[PDB]
Amino acid sequence: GRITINGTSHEVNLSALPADISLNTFIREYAGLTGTKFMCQEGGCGVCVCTLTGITGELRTWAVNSCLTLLNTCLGLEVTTSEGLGNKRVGYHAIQQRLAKMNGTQCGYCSPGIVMNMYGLLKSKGGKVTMEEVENSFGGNICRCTGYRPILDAMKSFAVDSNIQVPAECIDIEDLSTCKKQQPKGSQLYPDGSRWSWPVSLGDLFAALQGAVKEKLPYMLVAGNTAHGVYRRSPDIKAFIDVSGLAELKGHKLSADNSSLTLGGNLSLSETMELCRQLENTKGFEYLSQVWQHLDWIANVPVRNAGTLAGNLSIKHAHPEFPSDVFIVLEALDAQVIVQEAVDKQQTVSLASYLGSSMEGKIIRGLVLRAYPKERFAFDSYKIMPRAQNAHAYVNAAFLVEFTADAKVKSARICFGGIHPEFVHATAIENLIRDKNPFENGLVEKAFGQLSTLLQPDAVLPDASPVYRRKLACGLFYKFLLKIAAQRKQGLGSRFVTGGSLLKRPVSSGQQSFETFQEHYPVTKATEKHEGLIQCSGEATYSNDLPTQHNQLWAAFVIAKKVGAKVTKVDTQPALDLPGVVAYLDAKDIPGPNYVGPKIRDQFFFPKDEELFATGEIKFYGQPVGIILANSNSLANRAAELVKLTYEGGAEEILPSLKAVLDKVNKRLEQPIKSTIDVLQLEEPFDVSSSGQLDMGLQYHYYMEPQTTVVLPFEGGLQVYAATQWMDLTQDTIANVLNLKSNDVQVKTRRIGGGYGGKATRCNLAAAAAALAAHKLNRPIRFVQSLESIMTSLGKRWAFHCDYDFFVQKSGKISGIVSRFYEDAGYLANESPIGHTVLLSKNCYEFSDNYKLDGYLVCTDSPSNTPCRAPGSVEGIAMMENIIEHIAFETGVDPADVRFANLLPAHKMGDMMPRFLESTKYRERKAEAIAHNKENRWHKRGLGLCIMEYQIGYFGQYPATVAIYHSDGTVVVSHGGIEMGQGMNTKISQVAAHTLGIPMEQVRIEASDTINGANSMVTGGAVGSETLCFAVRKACETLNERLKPVREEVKPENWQDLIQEAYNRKINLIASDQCKQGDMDPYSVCGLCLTEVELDVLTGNYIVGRVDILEDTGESLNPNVDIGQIEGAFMMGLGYWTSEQVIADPKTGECLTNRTWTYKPPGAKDIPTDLRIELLPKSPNKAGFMRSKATGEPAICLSIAVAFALQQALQSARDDAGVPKSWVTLTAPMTPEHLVLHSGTEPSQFKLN
Amino acid sequence: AYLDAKDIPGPNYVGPKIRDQFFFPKDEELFATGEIKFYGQPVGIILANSNSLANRAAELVKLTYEGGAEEILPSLKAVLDKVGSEAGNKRLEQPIKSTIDVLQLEEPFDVSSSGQLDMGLQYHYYMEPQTTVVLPFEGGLQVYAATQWMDLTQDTIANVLNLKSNDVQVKTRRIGGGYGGKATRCNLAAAAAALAAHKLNRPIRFVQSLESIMTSLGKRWAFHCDYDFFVQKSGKISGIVSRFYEDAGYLANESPIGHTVLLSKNCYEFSDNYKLDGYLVCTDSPSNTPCRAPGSVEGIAMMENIIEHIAFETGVDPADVRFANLLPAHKMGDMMPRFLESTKYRERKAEAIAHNKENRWHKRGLGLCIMEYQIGYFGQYPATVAIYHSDGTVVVSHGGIEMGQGMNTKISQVAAHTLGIPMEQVRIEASDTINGANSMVTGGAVGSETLCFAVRKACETLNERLKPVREEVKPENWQDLIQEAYNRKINLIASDQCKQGDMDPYSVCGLCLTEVELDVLTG
Ligand SMILES: Cc1cc2nc3c(=O)[nH]c(=O)nc-3n(C[C@H](O)[C@H](O)[C@H](O)COP(=O)(O)OP(=O)(O)OC[C@H]3O[C@@H](n4cnc5c(N)ncnc54)[C@H](O)[C@@H]3O)c2cc1C
Ligand SMILES: Nc1nc2c(c(=O)[nH]1)N[C@H]1C(S)=C(S)[C@@H](COP(=O)(O)O)O[C@H]1N2
Ligand SMILES: Nc1nc2c(c(=O)[nH]1)N[C@H]1C(S)=C(S)[C@@H](COP(=O)(O)O)O[C@H]1N2
Ligand code: MOS
Ligand code: MOS
Ligand code: FES
Ligand code: FES
């Protein structure tokens, strides 16, 4: 057994490894290379992406997901990880260096995956790509920090057509212009009774396959192992047969007369796509440009490189409910399947026949496509997704229409997926249009109506509403007829034409405007990130990058699934029967209080008791009752699912959502905010009044580093390596739950791969579980929570509902507001954001005894909700800006004019807003959207304006130690702050360098720990960076004071001499200080966003176009850091208002949206096409630190501008639909589903003229 | 792999970027490049996948030599026999020239004699062998070094590898004995392990075999003394002439000779009547290094041996020769009479002489030694102390190295005493180059008390901060005080140091009486 990684050979003893070990597990735990991450384990996120190289007799390199690829299919290949491309000593790779120097890495957890995707892309294309291709290729790489713009600028600069400005220190890429697969003979047996075969011929395959069938072994024909990503591979699989090495299952044959194309069953989707580009200029196969487009909508680059045609169809075969895009395309083209059942025994059958017949002992040998000449055949297809890429379809469709000489239908194949498991063809519609001209009077009207009636979609959560899916399938057929009308020069009505087009998305771009002041350098300089290069190279270590410890085990939660019930009996035997499963631990094992929190509690974070392990009534679906420990992460997760719980009782009403509780209205409601106005008096006169609602759901943090703690038993205490924003609380919780001394519980947190609030407190269920296990079993424990564990058992941004009345003059001037809001706490009242909702409820508007505000905390049967970027602040701004927009709507006054009518006097927003509307050309662009909306029925433009005054305040204390080395005058800092991607360390390095008077490069920041970080408050509130900067500058001012007398006496010529002279005098070159609440004055951050959208009314899909952001950052400590904070914050908010959606099962309470398959944050193509950010000039802060303002949180509150833009577009559709002019409740999120449901569209409106 | 001097990025030099006159006056190579200076001089390293294989493979690397020394002179005796005791040769220096060119007696004498004192090398025999483990880490190095001086280990590695000091982090939790042999000789293995870790980008473990340690590394400096004494019948010293020679091995670095001179008079009275000349001798042998009480051993040995020789020439009892020479109104004058009385010296000394008259082949002996040992301070030593708000437990991380001498035991007592909490509540964490940044070597027997001073001072800062809170809330217990301090955002972390001059120097008086029995036929 043999694999090459980064140019080094590894002998693989297969007998000793799991049969199903992933390339990821092998890379991380056996080669010891921790650059390659994991998070989703299912192909959706990209953090695990590496490249394979193998033998036309030429070397091909392609990206794969290391989490999905099985080690045993990689034998003899060369594996490349980020570490393989460069490192500090040998020099960083062009791609690594370009991503760091162009500000495309924050937390850094996605950076290696990004680098290796780009490497894969460049190598597969002989180093020649377009900017468009580069932007198309990162659908599989989720970044939660950068908003992707700088990632796209960096990677686009490698393109032949690059128009990107590259920094002059960036090196040039090597020439990329254009090892053999190992295939042992016979099987390889495994202790557990598993077999691998590496057949070279079809004879060998059928030997292996007949073998497996006769010994009654469940088998798998292994290509990419990507199907696991969609439906988990059965544990019952014993015979693995690698088919990635059979030539006979690859390749293609154009028939002699160009009448048919035969495709290898196990061509990869990427190979099928390259084959499409080659044959799309061949008469009769021009339609393969549409097949290419539909394959480009499937999954992402690495899944398409690894995944195969036959693999996909095998999913459809096993799972009829699976709306395969390969299936719907091939069914519409009447593809034939070559089913082979021995070396000399094969049948060519219809797709439908393949699907209806057993495949036991049989393979797909190939697929047969016939020629469809351009003018005689119209072929088109659709995949409507909730975001731009890498999301399964609401509905997909493929349409094949043959036309006779006199423009009539000879035949039609009209196919939909996402309707119901037995629906394929719209048969009544194919028969309707047969032998007719589709454009003849009344036919399309009759066709919709009929189609609308025959679509009866199922309703299996978490799939979208049946009503949306029916309206979508109809709109798609309409869209097809509009498109082919345009192509065949059939007359259409001016207002209907664009209905047949897909939205224009140009190559995205950004602009940044900011000031720097050389007189403060290195402060206010725009710099790379302190850890940028180590983040991109995979040198940077996170908690789970700790090396393999001897006798280590992995932990996973065992969960209760019955809300209101009590667990009376636990059977662990099925878990413990698996070899490598060691133990189960529950509440009975906890020495100390069964409590997740500190010994001394407060009234904000910790007012309500929270168990580590449930001992009473189960409070939510997913509540942990214990942990399994096993010798692999895979086995721990699988064994934990096998522990059987017996329940006694159960709640007869489960209310797992804010809507469920409020619809039933009580012990679940508390009223922390009670207005001093009992009834609004409104003595002022008013011309317009109305009532409305605002509804905003949960948001999953989606940090790319999962919840992680490693605990080592050490010299009678514990060493804890925790991904936490608050080490002190981790330490406190572990010491309390185990009855230990805190000084024996040492926590080290060098960095975390994002937190956004979700690692403030929810890190401690896993940290305390891991520590419990390490303490009891006296062994290292690794607890890397699965995405499903995190999303099922841990909380999220609090959901928000508001009911309001407003009373205004015809100018939009507010006479009164009554508002009631409810925030969804989950099952515990802890960590309420309601204070900040109230703080920002007035935004920048003038009130006078005329704003009645009542606020309720609501407990639901769901995980305890937690802080998420700008908690309370987002809802406070959303609430007030919504009412502003609703006012504009009812009064007919422009939204800028309602804001002007209501602004506070003598206010910064009064200078900023007019200058912003001037520079963004707001007035002409608003008139433009309206003029366009008048000319077009199915494509609508909106412009949304959001303004804000965000409050910044300080809390807690943060220590910092600074030491100068006498050897060379270089500096180290270890502090109580956590670097989570926000550039705390970058800013700290500039401040230490500025204060001491030395270069930035001479400053290094070390790991945060419970020595130099003892007692430190949680890193959050956006003030972390400036707070640690205050601590470090104070410590450095102490060093300066000690150095001053040595300066004056020896008058040194340089820093090295000053420091050695101070060492000779025994000056202490170590200073420890802190920053505490009150060291700095609090302040506000004013921001404005203008967002432009184009809405496709028929699908609900939109493209966010130009976005303009102006924020007061004061004099920015680092414009690069602050631009990146604004883009990231805005983009997380753009997610909240677009594609991110959490669905709780209304009968069980289970969080159904619990993996990448079912939860969709912004991708690379979901961002604004034109992102322009301005840091306000000539605006020094009188308060805070060094004239600067925080940037980590405020911009997420401006993101509702996107919803305001879709709202204008949706209102224009409603107008055209004849809906009486009426407000539609704004919703986080504004999904395609939401917009089609409220657009007033009816299939009777589907006209050609 | 095999690595040698060709693979060194920076200077081929074991030591700091900025050198002194005591530790680093003379060039020392990591790997030899021209003339081999001693048998066992490393020229490179082999790296292998086990300790056994690495050691076996080292012996298989085939060296070809050219030329070779006329005469190899590997011991103090060899250099003095071949060169003579007179310095007018590159191998002999005279750091100590008596201001007396020739001794003139201002007192008359009844007995004169000449003698020699010969003391050889001593191997430290630390039970943990010379050990360094180096990990590549975020473009830098993590260094797990068995060292008495992290700062020198960091400085040396950073210099030889052309790295920033802040990218070379040394952690030393404890060592299994040092006794001076891990002050500087640790850095041959540490520099080599780091070079390999940096070049090969893998973890390197260097655990030096006993043979490697005793062949390639130095030892307690050997001592030779030639002396004349001139005394009265009583044993009262009229004059001494003393020449001594200390064996440096091939380099003059880390001379103990200054300490030999400081204790040469021990606790006896002299009047411009002690001629002392001291020579440093370079031998074809590993560079010799500090070993427990370097120079102090030889200085006391020299003076006490002269007392014992005087005793034997005059027939006066060794205690009585000491009485005749004691400095006036000295602590030793109070201690020695009480010591001789309580040990029953006079009786046991007579019992041994009586036993010896009766038995030809089984002889008894009684040996008396007295000393005044000088304790002085040098360098700066940092300490960081933190109190946890959760439970009031305390952690310390400092620039001292625990090598068994009980430094952490004493620190915990002092931190506990200063803060007013039980000892059990105090933990000491590993020494590192962050909280121990720039810290001097742990040696000179003052390490423990110097760190105790640094820790006490940090704990006094914490008390000053706790004082206002204690007077305001009048707490029932320490945990309540600490949590109230945390509530008011009092900083419960303090960092401070102890430097030379913070405490006053002093002497340690001691006496020893030893009884032996000797089998004359076997030895
Ligand atoms: C993140 C992600 C997103 C995706 N998005 C989409 C999407 O939007 N639309 C969509 O349609 N699909 C989607 N897919 C599915 C993807 O297309 C398939 O997983 C892939 O095509 C499977 O091929 P494979 O080589 O990986 O199969 P494997 O997992 O290796 O094998 C799958 C099955 O096929 C069988 N098999 C393999 N070769 C043959 C053969 N020649 N004859 C018979 N049986 C055979 C095996 O026995 C096995 O049971 C997605 C997958 C992932 C991971
Ligand atoms: N890259 C990155 N940026 C981030 C976060 C994060 O986890 N990763 N957290 C956000 C949140 S919720 C806060 S409170 C701040 C935390 O750091 P700061 O207080 O130093 O700005 O950064 C913000 N920006
Ligand atoms: N157990 C033990 N005791 C020891 C040593 C040692 O290595 N181990 N070294 C000795 C030497 S040479 C010195 S200088 C000191 C070092 O510690 P101290 O200076 O704090 O007493 O302890 C002495 N006692
Ligand atoms: O305070 Mo930010 O971690 S929700
Ligand atoms: O000073 Mo002791 O380390 S020879
Ligand atoms: S861990 Fe592999 S794609 Fe997410
Ligand atoms: S930098 Fe991309 S996920 Fe944090």
What would the 3-class secondary structure string for A125-150 be? CCCCCCHHHHHCCCCCCCCCCCCCHH
Of A144, A150, A61, nearest in space to A104 by CA: A150
B contact residues 364-383, partner A, Cβ 8 Å cutoff: 379-380, 382
Q: Do B434 and A1006 touch (CB under 8 A)?
A: yes
Q: Does the CB atom of residue A113 touch ligand 6 within 6 A? A: no
Q: Among partner residues B18, B166, B494, which is closest to A972 by beta-carbon distance?
A: B166
Q: What number of other Cβ atoms are within 10 A of residue B473's Cβ? A: 15
Closest atom of ligand 5 to CA, residue B178 = 3
Q: What number of other Cβ atoms are within 10 A of residue A1227's Cβ? A: 18
Distance CA A84, CA A538 (A): 9
Distance CA A53, CA A5 (A): 10
Distance CA A112, CA A27 (A): 13
Q: Do A1066 and B496 touch (CB under 8 A)?
A: no
∠ Cα A357 A360 A366 (to 5°): 70
Residues 6+ positions from A453 with CB-CB distance below 8 Å: none
A599 part of contact set with chain B, CB < 8 Å: yes
**In chain B, what is the straight-line distance between the N-terminal and C-terminal CA atoms, in Å?**
50
Length of chain B: 523
Assess contact for A1001 and A969: CB atoms under 8 A: no
Q: Which two tokens stand for residue B189?
A: 């293995």
Residues 6+ positions from A55 with CB-CB distance below 8 Å: A179, A180, A181
Q: Which of A1115, A1174, A1193, A1233 is catalytic?
A: A1193
DSSP state of A182: P
Distance CA A514, CA A1172 (A): 11
Distance CA B73, CA B355 (A): 45
A1006 part of contact set with chain B, CB < 8 Å: yes
Listing DSSP states for A1106-1168 in one string gives: EEEEEE--BS-S-HHHHHHHHHHHHHHHHHHTTT----B-TTT--BS--SGGG-----TTSS-
Distance CA A995, CA A461 (A): 58
Question: Per the annotation, where are the binding residues of B for Mo-molybdopterin?
Answer: 148, 292, 444
Would the annotation count A796 as a binding residue?
A: no
Q: What is the CATH number for A1052?
A: 3.30.365.10
Residue owning tokens 């008079």: B265
Atom 4 (ligand 5) nearest CA: B180
The helix (H) or strand (E) run that includes residue B335 is helix B331-342
β-bridge mates for residue B456, sequence order: none
Q: Do A88 and B426 touch (CB under 8 A)?
A: no
Closest chain A C-alpha to B145 CA, distance in angstroms = 18
Of A1009, A299, A491, nearest in space to A721 by CA: A1009
Q: Does the CB atom of residue B122 touch ligand 3 within 6 A? A: no
Distance CA A860, CA A1144 (A): 11
Please confirm whether the linkage preceding A522 is cis (ω < 30° from 0).
yes
A contact residues 628-647, partner B, Cβ 8 Å cutoff: none
Sheet holding A1070-1076: strands in order across?
A1003-1005, A971-975, A957-964, A1070-1076
What is the Å distance from ligand 7's center to A95 Cα? Answer: 16
What is the Å distance from ligand 2's center to A882 Cα? Answer: 26
Closest atom of ligand 4 to CA, residue A756 = 3
The helix (H) or strand (E) run that includes residue A902 is helix A895-902
Atom 1 (ligand 5) nearest CA: B443
Q: What number of other Cβ atoms are within 10 A of residue B312's Cβ? A: 13
Atom 49 (ligand 1) nearest CA: A220
B273 part of contact set with chain A, CB < 8 Å: no
A732 contact residues in B (CB cutoff 8 A): 390
A331 included as an active-site residue: no
A744 part of contact set with chain B, CB < 8 Å: yes
β-bridge mates for residue A219, sequence order: A239
Distance CA B308, CA B115 (A): 11
Distance CA A830, CA A866 (A): 8
Distance CA A79, CA A23 (A): 9
Specify the amino acid at residue A339. Answer: V
Q: Do A735 and B391 touch (CB under 8 A)?
A: yes
Which domain range does residue B495 map to?
380-499
Angle between helices B331-342 and B345-358 (to 10 degrees): 50
Mutational test site, ligand 4, from A869, A978, A1025, max ligand atoms within 8 Å of CB: A869
SS3 content of chain A, % helix, strand, coil (to 5): 30, 25, 45
Specify the amino acid at residue A1138. Answer: T
Q: Among partner residues B165, B382, B429, which is closest to A1011 by beta-carbon distance?
A: B429
Sheet holding A239-242: strands in order across?
A187-189, A195-197, A239-242, A219-222
The resolution in Å comes to 2.2
Q: Do A539 and B489 touch (CB under 8 A)?
A: no
Please confirm whether the linkage preceding A1052 is cis (ω < 30° from 0).
no
Atom 24 (ligand 2) nearest CA: A1192
Bridge-based pairing of strands A1102-1111 and A1083-1096 is antiparallel
Q: Among partner residues A541, A961, A963, which is closest to B138 by beta-carbon distance?
A: A541
Phi, psi of A804 (to 5 degrees): -145, 155
Q: Which two tokens stand for residue A377?
A: 């055949």
Of B397, B394, B184, B154, nearest in space to A1004 by CA: B154
Distance CA A977, CA A1031 (A): 10
A97 part of contact set with chain B, CB < 8 Å: no
- Angstrom distances, CA of residue A514 to CA of A530, A916, A949, A1114: 20, 15, 20, 11
A contact residues 530-549, partner B, Cβ 8 Å cutoff: 531, 533-534, 537, 539-541
Rg (C-alpha) for chain B, rounded Å, is 27
B389 contact residues in A (CB cutoff 8 A): 600, 728, 1015
Distance CA B437, CA B432 (A): 7
Assess contact for B2 and B44: CB atoms under 8 A: yes
Closest chain A C-alpha to B487 CA, distance in angstroms = 9
Q: Is A390 left (phi over 0), alpha (psi -120 to 50) or beta?
A: left
Kindly give the residue spans of alpha helices, DSSP state H, lying in A434-500. Answer: 443-454, 466-487
Distance CA A23, CA A501 (A): 42
Q: Does the CB atom of residue A150 touch ligand 4 within 6 A? A: no
β-bridge mates for residue B227, sequence order: B115, B242
Q: What number of other Cβ atoms are within 10 A of residue A588's Cβ? A: 9
Q: Does the CB atom of residue A500 touch ligand 4 within 6 A? A: no
Distance CA A1075, CA B439 (A): 27
Which domain range does residue A1036 map to?
957-1076
Distance CA A656, CA A695 (A): 16
Closest chain B C-alpha to A733 CA, distance in angstroms = 9
Q: Does the CB atom of residue A912 touch ligand 7 within 6 A? A: no
The three-state secondary structure class of B117 is strand
Q: Among partner residues A742, A967, A1074, which is closest to B154 by beta-carbon distance?
A: A967
A1012 part of contact set with chain B, CB < 8 Å: yes
Distance CA A718, CA A779 (A): 10
User: Is residue B206 exposed (0-12), middle (13-18) or buried (19+ Cβ within 10 Å)?
Assistant: buried
Q: Does the CB atom of residue A1023 touch ligand 4 within 6 A? A: no
Q: CA of B427: which chain A residue's CA is closest?
A: A743
Please confirm whether the linkage preceding A1229 is cis (ω < 30° from 0).
yes
Best residue in A1011, A1061, A1065, A1075 for a mutation probing chain B (most B CBs within 10 Å): A1011
Angle between helices A1055-1064 and A1024-1050 (to 10 degrees): 80
Kindly give the residue spans of alpha helices, DSSP state H, lying in A906-978. Answer: 908-919, 922-935
Distance CA B287, CA B91 (A): 13
- Angstrom distances, CA of residue A561 to CA of A495, A567, A614, A646, B122: 53, 10, 12, 10, 72
Q: Among partner residues B138, B167, B390, which is closest to A598 by beta-carbon distance?
A: B390
B contact residues 184-223, partner A, Cβ 8 Å cutoff: 198-199, 201
Contacts 24+ apart (CB under 8 A), A158-163: A158/A94, A158/A95, A158/A98, A158/A118, A158/A122, A158/A129, A158/A134, A159/A129, A159/A130, A159/A131, A159/A133, A159/A134, A160/A128, A160/A129, A160/A130, A161/A130, A161/A131, A162/A131, A163/A131
Q: Which two tokens stand for residue B201?
A: 């980008």
Distance CA A769, CA A922 (A): 54
Rg (C-alpha) for chain A, rounded Å, is 31
Listing DSSP states for B339-400 in one string gives: HHHHTTHHHHHHHHHHHHHH-SSEEEEEEEEEEEEEE---SEEEEEEEE-TTT--EEEEES-
Assess contact for A224 and A307: CB atoms under 8 A: yes
Q: Do A957 and B384 touch (CB under 8 A)?
A: no
Assess contact for A92 and A19: CB atoms under 8 A: no
Q: Among partner residues B140, B388, B491, which is closest to A959 by beta-carbon distance?
A: B491
Closest atom of ligand 6 to CA, residue A45 = 4
- Angstrom distances, CA of residue B462 to CA of A594, A1068, B389, B453: 33, 18, 13, 14
What is the Å distance from ligand 1's center to A243 Cα? Answer: 13
Phi, psi of A961 (to 5 degrees): -110, 130
Listing DSSP states for A668-693 in one string gives: TEEEEE--S-SS----S--SEEEEEE
Q: CA of A736: which chain B residue's CA is closest?
A: B390
Query: CA dihedral in degrees (A27, A31, A37, A42; nearest 10)?
Result: 20
Closest atom of ligand 6 to CA, residue A24 = 2
